[PDB]
Amino acid sequence: ILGGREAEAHARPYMASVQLNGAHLCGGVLVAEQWVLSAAHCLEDAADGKVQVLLGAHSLSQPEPSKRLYDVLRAVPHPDSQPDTIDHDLLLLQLSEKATLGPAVRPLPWQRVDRDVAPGTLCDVAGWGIVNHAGRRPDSLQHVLLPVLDRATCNRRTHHDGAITERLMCAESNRRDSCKGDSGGPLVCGGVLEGVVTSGSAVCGNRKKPGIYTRVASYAAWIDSVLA
C-alpha cells in the first residue's frame, strides 16, 4: 500500500494474509467462517508450495494472541481466470477448519447485488504490500481510503485503454494505490466488500494507471456456488 498509513491493529478482522511457504504472498478477505477470497494470480505461480492463510494478524512477524495460521483444504481459482489476463481474477481458499471468531477475526459482508459502486465513493483498501517504489515491505497492516473512479474515465486511452469490463472497477491511484503484495486484498465500501485487488500493474501510484479491482458482486453466483 502506497500513500496510506498503518491500520488500527485488528480493526479489520476480515483481513487475511495469504502465505506461500510461510511468507506473505497476497492479501485476502474472510467472507465465510471457512472461506477466504483472494486473487487467482496469487496462486498462478505457487505450484508445489505450501499455501496457508494467516488470520487475526496485524504484524506479519510479531507475537499476537489472535494470530492463527490455517492450512488450506482447497484452492479454487475462478475456472475462467488465466495467467495472461486480468479477467475473472478470483480465488477462494477453504480453511482447514472454520475460523475461530472474535474481536480480531470476523467475516465481512460482501455485495451480492450486481450494481456498480458509485463513482466518488470513498473505499478502504488494506494490505501488507510494498509501501514505496524502493520496494520496502511493511511488517504491519496498512490501509488507504481511495475514491472510486468512473469506469468510463478509467477506460480512457491514457489510462487502461478499454480493458476495464463491467466486471471490473477502478479507484484513483495518485500517490495512493495498492501495490505488489496487495493483490487479492479487499476494497471495502461502507463496511461491505465490493472489490478484490487485481494484477499488479508495472508502476504503483501512477495517476494515469488507476487501481483495478475485481467486482465481487459480478461473481456472486460463482462465489455462492463454491461456498454451497
Residue numbers in the entry: 1 to 228
Question: Can you provide the manuscript's text about this entry?
Answer:
Human factor D (FD) is a self-inhibited thrombin-like serine proteinase that is critical for amplification of the complement immune response. FD is a single-domain serine protease that has a unique physiological substrate. It converts the surface-bound alternative pathway pro-convertase C3bB into the active convertase C3bBb. A salt bridge between Arg202 (Arg218) on the self-inhibitory loop and Asp177 (Asp189) locks the S1 pocket and rigidifies the exosite.
The R202A (R218A) mutation disrupts a crucial interaction responsible for maintaining the self-inhibited state of FD. The previously reported crystal structure of FD R202A determined at 2.8 Å resolution showed the catalytic site in an active configuration with residual density indicating the presence of disorder, which could not be modelled. In addition, these data yielded weak electron density for a number of surface-exposed loops, suggesting high mobility and/or multiple conformations for these regions. The new map allowed a more detailed interpretation of the active site, showing multiple conformations that indicate the coexistence of both active and inactive configurations. Despite the overall improvement in electron density, however, the surface-exposed regions corresponding to the exosite loops remained poorly defined, with only few interpretable side chains. The R202A FD variant has enhanced activity towards artificial peptides and simultaneously displays active and inactive conformations of the active site. Partially active conformations of the catalytic site in FD R202A (R218A) versus completely inactive conformations for the wild type are consistent with the observed increase in the catalytic activity of FD R202A (R218A) towards artificial peptide substrates. Biophysical analyses using thermal shift assays and circular-dichroism spectroscopy showed very similar results for wild-type and R202A (R218A) FD.
